[PDB]
From a paper:
Cobamides (Cbas) are coenzymes used by cells across all domains of life, but de novo synthesis is only found in some bacteria and archaea. Base activation is catalyzed by a phosphoribosyltransferase (PRTase). To gain insights into the mechanism of base activation by the PRTase from Methanocaldococcus jannaschii (MjCobT), we solved crystal structures of the enzyme in complex with substrate and products. The protein fold consists of an eight-stranded mostly parallel β-sheet with connecting α-helices on both sides where the substrate binding pocket is built from the connecting loops and resides at the end of the C-terminal end of β-strands.
None of the structures described here contain a free base, although they were present in all crystallization experiments. This is true for the apo structure, which contains no ligands in the active site. Superposition of these two structures shows that significant changes occur in the loops extending from Ile 37 to Ile 45, Ser 293 to Lys 314, and Pro 333 to Tyr 348, such that the active site of the apo structure is open to solvent in contrast to that of the complex with either NaMN or α-RP and nicotinic acid. The rms difference between these two structures is 0.94 Å for 329 equivalent residues, indicating the significant conformational changes that occur when substrates bind. Strikingly, residues Lys 173 to Asn 181 that were disordered in the apo structure became ordered upon ligand binding and contribute to the distal component of the binding pocket for the nitrogenous base. Altogether, the movement of the surface loops serves to close the active site on substrate binding.
Author numbering:
A (entry chain A), B (entry chain A): 1 to 171, 182 to 349
Write the structure that this text describes.
């Protein structure tokens, strides 16, 4: 009941009681090394996606030694995901699709090379192969429910490129749009372009992998929560163009945070509307009824989501986790760190 | 009933009907590049472990383009494993623990660096960390039953080193024993040595990973089939010294081929006897009632086992697979290849 639900279509009943697998797909983008399309600082951006999944899987990052909660009590999104993993004993297994630095936990290697130069239109040359790798991997994972998140610094830009390239209406932000517009041009994207032509131009390698995993579960009549926001709407668009029919089973949902579902300029629901009547679910954290400033002002400043935090919280709450156990886990971890 | 069973202890009843996960742990050993302790030829030995798991997971190897069945009809062990995977729809996911060349299928990366120089006593420096990585990975895999095989060229030597080092009585073969005897000496293995001191001296990186995975399943009261022969007996010895108590649950078995269970000089049952009353199971292939020579003479020449072929066949037959469907799968694949 701490869950928002747009076009629910029964989906919450399907995920109740199901044993889940949580997986985060990570990648890096060459563009982000010289064009500030990501908020992640240049001196940590190479380490950041692997540090996220290390924290979720092991409980702390192993190369980045920066605290996961800052001095004001503001948690990184991976900290929220880790809270749900610990509180609800969520099995988790993470996939690399080209992060600059590889995790030091066990991880599934799907592609060692990073996503390329978006502005040159040279994101990928293998999106179709990445999709089939994601599909065959998905066939070999055994769970009642797939929760799949992402951690790609700069993935809001590639998700804009893909939503535009497939024809959708999706509109700092001025620089994001120059990068993709130039990329779609320099790779000659027309309207007879395939979804793989568009991914190869301006996508990120996470998107075809996640699409592959989602379709393989939805084909076997198993629910999928795409745990993210804008980046996940681009994956949904990819799915529709690959296997439109399985979208209609109403087994693929989008899980995000309340902070994303009401973003002034974001309009996640505007995007999903153009794609289809897909369930969209947000989790309520009640961070404002909290002691520390960073947690209390969490809804302000940056739109806060990542590493499947929103979507795994949706699953956790729907399965009887008191929502404020998340807040108190973070608070207890804050005071253990001392900063 | 095409299953041999020594000290069955009820184990076959536990695995009937269980949904399995099959996983192969691969590694390479620096020793094998300059000392002929492996039968695998020097010009394919770097490619061979990854080619095995590619074949099991995808249905063909992707860098080694040599046929998986030779011109006389003799199948590689990975071909038998792939037969069971296809016929019984076995979910499979493979782990790298230092193979020279990495698989081109998705795979779990646990350690990129190969096992070191056995004869120098420098196999590993991280066996305890590899074990915990295997244990934490195992906690995050969801199946009713674990079938875990191996593919390590030269692993018969490291398994001799470990069985000797832990004090067991385990005795071409003359050169294997010089390599390990020198390794145990040059690393000063005494009788106050830990199991991790011995693995760090003359083990292979597959052994602590597999031990970690086995114990994590057996602790949650789930059966494990250690799918191999002599190499797997060394893993059982490692397990006993790490967590002797979970051995007694009678949830960890050894699955191998009939060709291994009756090897003149091997004596698998002699080894397992010194370790404990562990179930040992062999699968019957009836390759002698076959047309092609290589399949008909399969019991002759080389002791034939690898890539969990024996153990996954045990699981498959016990769950109602007609044993000669394996033979006919290989025969049909032989004639498709034409060689």
């Amino acid at each position: 009941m701490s869950i928002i639900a747009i076009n629910e279509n029964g989906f919450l009943d399907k995920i109740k009681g199901r044993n889940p697998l949580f997986t985060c797909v990570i990648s890096s983008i060459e563009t982000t090394l010289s064009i500030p399309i990501s908020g992640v600082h240049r001196d940590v951006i190479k380490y950041t996606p692997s540090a996220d999944v290390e924290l979720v899987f092991y409980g702390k990052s192993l190369t980045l030694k920066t605290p996961p909660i800052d001095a004001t009590g503001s948690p990184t999104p991976a900290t929220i995901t880790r809270a749900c993993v610990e509180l609800k004993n969520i099995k988790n297994l993470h996939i690399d699709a080209g992060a600059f630095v590889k995790p030091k936990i066990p991880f599934i290697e799907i592609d060692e090379k990073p996503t390329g130069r978006i502005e040159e239109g040279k994101a990928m040359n293998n999106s179709k192969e990445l999709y089939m790798k994601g599909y065959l991997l998905g066939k070999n994972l055994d769970a009642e429910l797939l929760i799949v998140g992402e951690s790609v610094p700069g993935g809001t830009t590639t998700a804009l490129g893909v939503l535009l390239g497939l024809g959708y209406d999706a509109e700092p932000h001025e620089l994001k749009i120059k990068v993709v517009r130039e990329g779609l041009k320099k790779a000659g994207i027309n309207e007879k372009s395939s979804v793989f032509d568009v991914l190869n131009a301006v996508g990120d390698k996470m998107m075809p992998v996640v699409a592959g995993l989602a379709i393989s579960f939805a084909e076997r009549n198993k629910p999928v929560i795409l745990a993210g926001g804008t980046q996940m709407s681009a994956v949904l668009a990819v799915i529709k163009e690959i296997n439109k029919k399985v979208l209609d089973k109403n087994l693929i949902a989008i899980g995000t945070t309340e902070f994303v579902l009401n973003d002034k300029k974001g309009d996640l629901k505007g995007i999903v509307e153009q794609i289809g009547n897909v369930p969209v679910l947000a989790s309520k954290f009640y961070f404002e009824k909290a002691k520390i400033e960073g947690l209390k002002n969490y809804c302000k400043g940056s739109v806060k989501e990542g590493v499947g935090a929103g979507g795994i919280a949706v699953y956790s709450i729907v399965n009887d986790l008191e929502p404020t156990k998340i807040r108190e886990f973070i608070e207890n971890k804050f005071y253990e760190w001392y900063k």
